[PDB]
C-alpha cells in the first residue's frame, strides 16, 4: 500500500535546516561580541560532591545490609539440623519398607484385622442369639 | 538496514572539537568577536538532528519492505491453500466429508418426519376418537 | 523412628481401631433400640 | 538395625493387642452386666 | 544464586567519578583566584 508517510512529513521539515544551515553568511554577520560563562571550579565540586555523598551514603550503610548477609548464614546454621533431620527421615520411609514391610507387618494387618472381624461376625452371630433367647 | 551501532561514540561527538590554529590578525576573522564561533558550532551541531531523521526514514522505508513482503505472501497464499485442497481431496480423508455428510443429516431427516409422521397419525386417531 | 511408625504406615490399623470402636459403639446403641 | 526392628516391632505390636484385648474384656463385661440388667 | 547486588549498584556511581574526574580541562576554566586562608598560630596553639 502507498502508507507509511511518517518518513515523509518530515521531508519538508529536513531539507529546511539544510537550506538555512549553511548558506549563512550573506545573511547574517559576525559581531558584537557574545560573553560565554561556562562554569569555574564550584561547579566542578558540586560535580563531583553529590556524586561522592551517593555513595558516601551507600557505603555507610554497607553495615546493615551485610548484617542480614551474615544473619542468614547463622539463619542457615539453626535451620541446617532441622534439614538434616527432614533428609534423613526421607530415605527410611523406602529403607523401612525393605526391612519390615514387605514382611511382618502384612502379617500383622491379616492377623489384627481379618482375625478380630472374624470375632466380630461371631459376636454379631451370638448377640443375635441373645436378642432370640431373650425375645423367646 | 538495522543497526544498532552504539550508544557511545554518538555522545561524544556531541562534545568534540579538534580546535585548529586559526591565525589572529587575518581577514578570516577581522574583529576576532566571539560570534562567528557561535555560527560555525551551532551549524555543525545541527548536522547529527539530520542524521536522527535519515535513521527514521531508514526505519519506516524498512517497515514498508516489511508490510509488502507479506502482501506479496498473502498474494501467494491461495496458490498454497489450491494443492494443499488437493491434498485433502485425493487421500482417504473423504471419509471425513462423505461420512459426516450422510449419514448424520440423512438419518435426522428420516427420522424426524417418521417421528412427526407417527405423532401426526396418533392425532388423528385421537381425534377421531373425540368425533365419533 | 517412633514418628515413622506414628505415620501414615501405622493409620490403616489406627482407623481400624477407630471404625472398630465405631462398630462397637453401633452395637451399645443397637441394644438400646 | 536392632533399634529399627526392635523398636518398630515388640512396643507396638504388645500395644495393639493388649488394647484390643483389653476392650474385647471390657466389652464383654458390659455385655455380663448388660444381661444381668436384661434378666 | 543470583544475589548481593551490592558490589553492583555501586557500579553506575562508581563509573561516574572515574568519568569526570579527569576528562575536566575542556568543560571548566582555571581562572578567579580563589583564596586559600589556613591557619595561623593560634590555631597551633590550639
Redesign the interface.
Given at each position: 500500500?502507498n502508507?507509511?508517510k511518517?518518513?515523509?512529513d518530515?521531508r519538508p521539515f529536513?531539507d529546511e535546516?539544510?537550506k538555512t544551515?549553511?548558506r549563512?553568511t550573506p545573511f547574517?554577520?559576525?559581531?558584537?561580541?557574545?560573553?560565554?560563562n561556562?562554569?569555574?571550579?564550584y561547579?566542578?565540586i558540586s560535580?563531583?560532591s553529590k556524586?561522592?555523598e551517593?555513595?558516601a551514603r551507600?557505603?555507610w550503610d554497607?553495615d546493615n545490609?551485610?548484617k542480614k548477609?551474615f544473619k542468614n548464614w547463622d539463619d542457615l546454621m539453626k535451620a541446617f539440623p532441622e534439614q538434616a533431620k527432614d533428609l534423613f527421615?526421607g530415605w527410611?520411609?523406602d529403607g523401612?519398607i525393605d526391612?519390615?514391610?514387605h514382611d511382618?507387618?502384612k502379617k500383622?494387618?491379616a492377623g489384627?484385622?481379618s482375625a478380630?472381624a472374624l470375632?466380630?461376625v461371631t459376636?454379631?452371630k451370638q448377640?443375635n442369639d441373645?436378642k432370640s433367647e431373650?425375645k423367646d
Open positions: 500500500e502508507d507509511f511518517y518518513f515523509d518530515i529536513l535546516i539544510y544551515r549553511e549563512y547574517y554577520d559576525d559581531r558584537a561580541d557574545y560573553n560565554t561556562s562554569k569555574s571550579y561547579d566542578y560535580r563531583l556524586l561522592i551517593v555513595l551507600r557505603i554497607y545490609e551485610l548477609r527421615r527410611l520411609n523401612t526391612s519390615i514391610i511382618e507387618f500383622y494387618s489384627l484385622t478380630f470375632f466380630k459376636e454379631m448377640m441373645f431373650v
